[PDB]
Amino acid sequence: KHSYTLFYFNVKALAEPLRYLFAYGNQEYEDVRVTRDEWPALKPTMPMGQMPVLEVDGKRVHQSISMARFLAKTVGLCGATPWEDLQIDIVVDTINDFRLKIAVVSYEPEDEIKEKKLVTLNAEVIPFYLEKLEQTVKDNDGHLALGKLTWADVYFAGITDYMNYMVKRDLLEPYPALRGVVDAVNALEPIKAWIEKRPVTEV
Amino acid sequence: KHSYTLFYFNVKALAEPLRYLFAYGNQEYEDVRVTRDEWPALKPTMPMGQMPVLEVDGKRVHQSISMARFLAKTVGLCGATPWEDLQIDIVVDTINDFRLKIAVVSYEPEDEIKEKKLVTLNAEVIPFYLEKLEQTVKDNDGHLALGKLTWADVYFAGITDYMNYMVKRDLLEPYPALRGVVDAVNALEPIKAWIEKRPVTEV
Numbered sequence: 001k002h003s004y005t006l007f008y009f010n011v012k013a014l015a016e017p018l019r020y021l022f023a024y025g026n027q028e029y030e031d032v033r034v035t036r037d038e039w040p041a042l043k044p045t046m047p048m049g050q051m052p053v054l055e056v057d058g059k060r061v062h063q064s065i066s067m068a069r070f071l072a073k074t075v076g077l078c079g080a081t082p083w084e085d086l087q088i089d090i091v092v093d094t095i096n097d098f099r100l101k102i103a104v105v106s107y108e109p110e111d112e113i114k115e116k117k118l119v120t121l122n123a124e125v126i127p128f129y130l131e132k133l134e135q136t137v138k139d140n141d142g143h144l145a146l147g148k149l150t151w152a153d154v155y156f157a158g159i160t161d162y163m164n165y166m167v168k169r170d171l172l173e174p175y176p177a178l179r180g181v182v183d184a185v186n187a188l189e190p191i192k193a194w195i196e197k198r199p200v201t202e203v
Numbered sequence: 204k205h206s207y208t209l210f211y212f213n214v215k216a217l218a219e220p221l222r223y224l225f226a227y228g229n230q231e232y233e234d235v236r237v238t239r240d241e242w243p244a245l246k247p248t249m250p251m252g253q254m255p256v257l258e259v260d261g262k263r264v265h266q267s268i269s270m271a272r273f274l275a276k277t278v279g280l281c282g283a284t285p286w287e288d289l290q291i292d293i294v295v296d297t298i299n300d301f302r303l304k305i306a307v308v309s310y311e312p313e314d315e316i317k318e319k320k321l322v323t324l325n326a327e328v329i330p331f332y333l334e335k336l337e338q339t340v341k342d343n344d345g346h347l348a349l350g351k352l353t354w355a356d357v358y359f360a361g362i363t364d365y366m367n368y369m370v371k372r373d374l375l376e377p378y379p380a381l382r383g384v385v386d387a388v389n390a391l392e393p394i395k396a397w398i399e400k401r402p403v404t405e406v
């Protein structure tokens with residue numbers, strides 16, 4: 001019925017939550033891993049010249065969070081009403097805001113102003129977001145939204161390795177409830193099979 | 204029969220798209236405008252300490268793009284399928300990405316950094332985003348998505364003044380199709396009535 005192709009670099013990073021959602025839904029897709037050398041040539045064929053991109057029946061889309069939301073709908077990992085969908089959207093937006101704050105410091109400045117912001121990141125931002133999310137999980141019985149499995153859980157499990165990579169430590173060590181969410185997603189049979197089969201990469 | 208309260212500062216800025224959507228749907232709501240003085244005392248009661256905040260039957264939510272998507276569903280400004288909704292989501296994410304890039308410059312700390320970034324913003328960032336959106340509108344018969352009125356149009360019409368305020372000029376001068384989308388939303392009877400009604404604020 002539907003043809004799916006994912007374009008990204010040979011890394012997990014922002015595409016890995018999409019790869020998780022495809023695995024979750026038993027959905028065959030072509031996992032195109034563009035080399036650094038080949039990227040100049042393929043860039044003009046990507047919307048806005050960025051990745052990840054999905055091509056769905058020949059039509060290309062971008063914006064990884066919105067594509068994750070779409071894939072979640074196709075696999076029943078959303079809610080039943082606009083209100084429920086909003087609750088999931090909010091927590092994913094919060095996770096993304098957090099990811100962006102880490103990225104801006106880690107991948108951000110070339111010079112060593114990184115030093116001062118990294119202090120603010122570690123001392124204020126990281127503990128602040130992770131404590132909020134930890135409480136959310138406790139308030140929702142081991143889930144990020146709606147007191148049940150949703151794509152917020154799958155997104156978070158799919159993005160945590162990247163966030164860890166960017167700060168160079170296990171961010172979830174102090175947060176057993178958040179670790180519980182990630183472990184529970186990673187233990188789902190098709191996601192487990194994907195993790196075992198996927199290309200081993202640093203990022 | 205549902206009770207809606209919007210909390211924000213006494214400005215248009217980030218909440219104005221939400222106010223447009225309430226107007227569009229003829230949905231009564233409490234427009235709570237938190238003055239600069241009240242804010243530090245009120246802040247600790249708000250989710251993640253930010254605004255805008257929507258209260259729906261007492262339940263507080265935040266994240267303005269996700270709240271706009273929720274109001275859009277409530278007033279009928281979405282698509283027919285998840286695929287169609289994805290198209291609208293992507294363009295709003297793009298608009299938000301652009302707005303954030305403006306904001307990073309506009310509120311920049313040291314003046315030597317602000318000035319360097321402003322150069323890049325004007326020469327590279329602004330044309331990159333707006334040229335693409337301009338072409339999109341031309342490819343969608345005067346609309347940002349689905350060749351018809353969607354909440355992407357309403358969002359864009361409701362945020363344009365804020366982007367212009369931050370750069371201190373009319374960003375849409377080179378982009379007549381984009382101005383057309385804004386004028387067409389602004390001319391919609393319920394929106395026109397709101398624009399005339401609303402408090403006059405600098406932002």
Ligand SMILES: N[C@H](CCC(=O)N[C@@H](CS)C(=O)NCC(=O)O)C(=O)O
Binds near residue numbers: 216217252253267268
């Ligand atoms: N995630 C943003 C939140 C933006 C936000 O945090 N709002 C600002 C002002 S527009 C704020 O209340 N920040 C703290 C403050 O100004 O006291 C959204 O799209 O709603």
